[PDB]
């Protein structure tokens, strides 16, 4: 688990497989960002003609008898006056991939000189650490013979004092243990990550942390609470649903309580409104909202933030079969709101609705933040690298946007358009579960908002349908499950709730 170390002296550093040298780009030419031993400079002179120091650019070369490390990566950081946290995070993520592909296990990273820049050492180190940790991850693999890329085992940052660097490193490492859990849960087979498995994961977290308690509802208990929207989605499933409540009481004397809700559809066939095969292929990802809540709670308990947080995960497959809930029928949530089914493939908002009602009935929330791979319309709206979110509270939205900016997990607020609430109109129910216009992400958000039933709680909804899972690898995330949102929300809670 411990990966990153600080080392003050360049001269007293230990041998490592690789050395990462930082460069700026100055007038389209590579420019050393730190003081480099002139013997090392001669070694990579050959490589400078095709390396200009553009951000994330790398050049790989071998050392010689005059260098300690026998592999050398030149890493571009871009223009020095334009250096940013996302630039640093993405550059060291890129270097991590290069190092691992070169089969390196130990790395020395020379820290640049940034004293002349308004960019702080703390911010640089935080993003260096996050970029390395993000791409030092392996998604699960099942090959008959293990084929996975080797991990980096030790990464030493040269030129910083242990006091400043190590506190940052250990914090990011504990946070990324939660990120990795999220990624593992999303990546793993849907036949393995069932609703029961999600409950077992939550029970294991509660077992591990004295600060965490858990409550698990099976199908019978879901029906006893009258959560008929979750029960309807689960009706046809061949595995039993679960409703999972995690409680972290880090500030028992405060009434301030954050409720996190994660959509846990462990496989989404679409139901009777069956998805086309090519649309169904990745649908083990449809529980990424739930996995995000679990990963946040892992980091929350490890970091021991002094705040109160409750996690709520409705979990079920959305199956097709003889007992599947019906197109055109009306189902009723636990407070009596009725929902006419326009599409069984709009099932996530149903189970979130009962979870929201549950939160308001039992958890006295100050704010509710939900996470869901909710709509295809969101991927059309904002693509795979920016997640849209909705919020009924401008402070909450501004805070989440600031946390997004500072962690590099890109969010973009979208509007809760009042004119589109009528798009959910039903003649026979409080609402339909799909809107009559084309703005599917907005009407899905407006649907969730109904379940606040005019309670004044602050609420934000993150539609991670695009960012949760990448079929094409894109910085700063691995291929497939990204873990998007875990880092952003831990930073939000630490910065805006815990002080």
Per the annotation, binding residues for Mn(2+) are: 263, 268, 286, 345, 347
Q: Is 161 exposed, middle or buried (0-12, 13-18, 19+ CB in 10 A)?
A: exposed
The answer to whether 391 and 413 are in contact (CB under 8 A) is yes
Q: Is residue 179 near Cl ion by the rule CB under 5 A? A: no
For Na ion, give the closer residue by CB, 31 or 385: 385
Structure tokens at 490: 């831990």
What is the bridge-based pairing of β-strands 29-32 and 58-62?
Answer: unpaired
Q: Is 416 exposed, middle or buried (0-12, 13-18, 19+ CB in 10 A)?
A: middle
In the set 458, 460, 462, 497, which binds Cl ion (CB under 5 A)?
Answer: 458
| 270 vs 138: CA distance, rounded Å | 29
Interhelix angle 162-187/121-135, nearest 10 degrees: 30
In the set 129, 206, 288, 332, which binds Na ion (CB under 5 A)?
Answer: 206
Q: Which residues contact 253 (CB under 8 A, 6 or more apart)?
A: none
Binding pattern to Na ion, positions 58-97, x when CB under 5 A? ----------------------------------------
Q: Which residues contact 101 (CB under 8 A, 6 or more apart)?
A: 149
- Which residues of this protein are in contact with Zn ion, per CB under 5 A? 265, 268, 286, 345, 347-348
For Zn ion, give the closer residue by CB, 161 or 279: 279
Task: Give SS3 for 37.
Answer: coil
Rounded to a whole number of angstroms, the minimum distance from the CB of residue 109 to Zn ion is 41
Q: Is residue 75 near Cl ion by the rule CB under 5 A? A: no
Q: Among 14-22, 159-167, 201-209, 232-240, which window interacts with Na ion (CB under 5 A)?
A: 201-209
Residue 265 interacts with, from Cl ion, Zn ion, Na ion, none (CB under 5-8 Å by kind): Zn ion
For Na ion, give the closer residue by CB, 24 or 297: 297
For Na ion, give the closer residue by CB, 214 or 334: 214
| SS3 track for 437-482 | CCCHHHHHHHHHHHCCCCCCCEEEEEECCCCCEECCCCCCCCCEEC
Q: Among 159-167, 319-327, 333-341, 380-388, which window interacts with Na ion (CB under 5 A)?
A: 380-388
Q: Is residue 347 near Na ion by the rule CB under 5 A? A: no
Binding pattern to Cl ion, positions 418-457, x when CB under 5 A? ----------------------------------------
Residues between 396 and 415 with contacts to Cl ion, criterion CB under 5 A: 396
Chain-centroid distance, C-alpha 54:
27
Establish whether 275 is a catalytic residue.
Answer: yes
The residues annotated as belonging to the active site are 275, 349
């Amino acid at each position: 688990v411990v990966l990153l170390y600080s080392q003050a002296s360049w001269d007293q550093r230990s041998k490592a497989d690789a050395l990462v040298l930082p460069f700026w780009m100055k007038n389209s030419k590579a420019q050393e960002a730190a003081v480099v031993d002139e013997d090392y400079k001669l070694v990579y002179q050959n490589a400078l003609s095709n390396f200009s120091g553009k951000k994330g650019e790398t050049a790989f070369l071998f050392g010689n008898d005059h260098t300690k490390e026998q592999k050398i990566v030149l890493l571009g950081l871009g223009k020095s006056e334009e250096v940013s946290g996302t630039t640093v995070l993405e550059a060291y993520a890129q270097a991590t991939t290069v190092l691992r592909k070169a089969k390196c296990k130990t790395v020395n990273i020379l820290f640049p000189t940034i004293s002349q820049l308004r960019f702080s050492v703390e911010e640089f180190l935080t993003n260096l650490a996050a970029g390395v940790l993000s791409l030092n991850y392996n998604y699960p693999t099942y090959h008959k013979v293990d084929t996975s890329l080797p991990f980096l085992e030790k990464v030493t940052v040269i030129g910083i004092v242990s006091k400043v660097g190590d506190k940052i490193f250990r914090k990011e490492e504990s946070l990324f243990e939660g990120v990795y859990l999220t990624r593992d849960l999303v990546n793993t087979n849907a036949d393995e990550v069932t609703p029961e498995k999600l409950a077992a994961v939550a029970k294991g977290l509660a077992g591990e942390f004295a600060s965490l308690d858990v409550k698990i509802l099976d199908r019978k208990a879901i029906l006893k609470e009258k959560m008929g929207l979750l029960a309807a989605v689960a009706k046809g499933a061949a595995v039993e649903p679960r409703f999972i409540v995690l409680d972290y009481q880090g500030k028992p004397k405060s009434k301030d309580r954050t409720v996190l809700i994660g959509k846990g559809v462990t496989f989404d066939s679409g139901g009777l409104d069956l998805k086309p095969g090519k649309a169904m292929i990745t649908m083990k990802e449809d529980m990424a909202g739930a996995a995000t809540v679990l990963g946040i709670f892992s980091a929350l308990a490890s970091l021991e933030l002094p705040i109160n947080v409750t996690g709520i995960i409705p979990a079920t497959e959305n199956a097709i079969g003889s007992a599947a809930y019906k197109m055109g029928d009306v189902y009723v949530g636990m407070t009596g709101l009725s929902v006419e089914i326009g599409s069984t493939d709009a099932e996530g908002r149903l189970i979130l609705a009962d979870a929201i009602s549950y939160a308001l009935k039992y958890c006295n929330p100050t704010r509710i933040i939900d996470f869901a791979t909710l709509t295809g319309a969101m991927v059309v709206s904002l693509g795979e690298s920016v997640a849209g979110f909705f919020a009924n509270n401008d402070v909450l939205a501004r805070d989440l946007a600031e946390a997004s900016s500072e962690t590099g997990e890109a969010l973009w607020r979208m509007p809760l358009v009042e004119k589109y609430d009528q798009a959910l109109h039903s003649d026979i129910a409080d609402m339909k579960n799909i809107g009559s216009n084309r703005a599917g992400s907005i009407t899905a958000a407006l649907f969730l908002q109904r379940f606040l039933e005019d309670n004044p709680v602050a609420w934000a909804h993150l539609d991670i349908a695009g960012t949760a899972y990448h079929e094409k690898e894109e910085l700063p995330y691995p291929k497939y499950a990204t873990g998007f949102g875990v880092r952003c929300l831990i930073h939000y809670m630490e910065k805006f709730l815990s002080k």
